[PDB]
Design a binder for this molecule. Structure first.
Ligand SMILES: CC(C)n1cc(C(=O)c2cncc(N[C@@H]3COC[C@@H]3c3ccc(F)cc3)n2)c2c(N)ncnc21
Length: 278
């Protein structure tokens, strides 16, 4: 093992973002010039808020992932007050940024990024890991414009937590259980948001959004790519055992074979040149 890193090994730079229990800061390792996104978590706050399980799971899940469509965890260390996780620096930021910037994706762009997401979910589910809070804010983009999915402290590892309201699956509201097919529901919402520019269930507060989700209350705009609409319809299904991609629907084969993805080559997407946005 390389020796444990420590804060004095880095020149810390700008804050990349701030969350409830952590802050992500750009850092340059002095010995190498390499840049990392270092997530910094204060131990007292985690302990006080009973978040030890989530921080431990984040580290344990990330250390298991070895795939190009996920943020990598390179190292961890801690001082008296703080934990530090050394992550890949995804230089192009959140997918959410591009959706806002561009408005909505054309069909080529929608299909390519949707295929990367499906391919990442196939890998994650194959290891028995459910993300449980998938959304455009934690699907990051590297400097080559491939995805890197992050934000694993809320993940479930298969042998309590409700995600961002827009992407919450009806089973979490109707019987508090999560399964692989909950991530496929979020996938449906994300595909919808790429094409439409907005997520499918929106309202002025969380209670109202939850009410639309359990009623399957959303509509497609007139413009929506027909094969993408057909795919979203087969993912936003109330019954979690009937979503394309789930085990009871015979898994990722039938999803990857959906007509929306006809021209996709699945085997080497990360070596393909992404289509330019917009
Ligand atoms: C875009 C920027 C902020 N950013 C984030 C990166 C992470 O890895 C990461 C890790 N855990 C969660 C998370 N996002 C969570 C989803 O919604 C908000 C919440 C949140 C939570 C804490 C926080 F501090 C910022 C955002 N992101 C990253 C990176 N690796 N490389 C380049 N930039 C990066």
């Amino acid at each position: 093992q390389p020796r444990k890193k420590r804060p004095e090994d880095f020149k810390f730079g700008k804050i990349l973002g701030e969350g409830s229990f952590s802050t992500v800061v750009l850092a340059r390792e002095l010995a190498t010039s390499r840049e990392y996104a270092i997530k910094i978590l204060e131990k007292r706050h985690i302990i006080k808020e009973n978040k030890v399980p989530y921080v431990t799971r984040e580290r344990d899940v990330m250390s298991r992932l070895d795939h190009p469509f996920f943020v990598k965890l390179y190292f961890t260390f801690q001082d008296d007050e703080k934990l530090y996780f050394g992550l890949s620096y995804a230089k192009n930021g959140e997918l959410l940024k591009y959706i806002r910037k561009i408005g909505s994706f054309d069909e080529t762009c929608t299909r390519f990024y949707t295929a990367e997401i499906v391919s990442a979910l196939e890998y994650l589910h194959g290891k028995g890991i459910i993300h449980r809070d998938l959304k455009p804010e934690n699907i990051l983009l590297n400097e080559d414009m491939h995805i890197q999915i992050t934000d694993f402290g809320t993940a479930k590892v298969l042998s309590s937590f409700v995600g961002t309201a827009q992407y919450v699956s009806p089973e979490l509201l109707t019987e508090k259980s999560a399964c692989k097919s909950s991530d496929l529901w979020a996938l449906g919402c994300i595909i919808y948001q790429l094409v439409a520019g907005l997520p499918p269930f929106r309202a002025g507060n969380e209670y109202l959004i939850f009410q639309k989700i359990i009623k399957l209350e959303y509509d497609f705009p007139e413009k929506f790519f027909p094969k993408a609409r057909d795919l979203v319809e087969k993912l936003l299904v109330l019954d979690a055992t009937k979503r394309l991609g789930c085990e009871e629907m015979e898994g990722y084969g039938p999803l990857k074979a959906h007509p929306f993805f006809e021209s996709v080559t699945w085997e080497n997407l990360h070596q393909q040149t992404p289509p330019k946005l917009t």
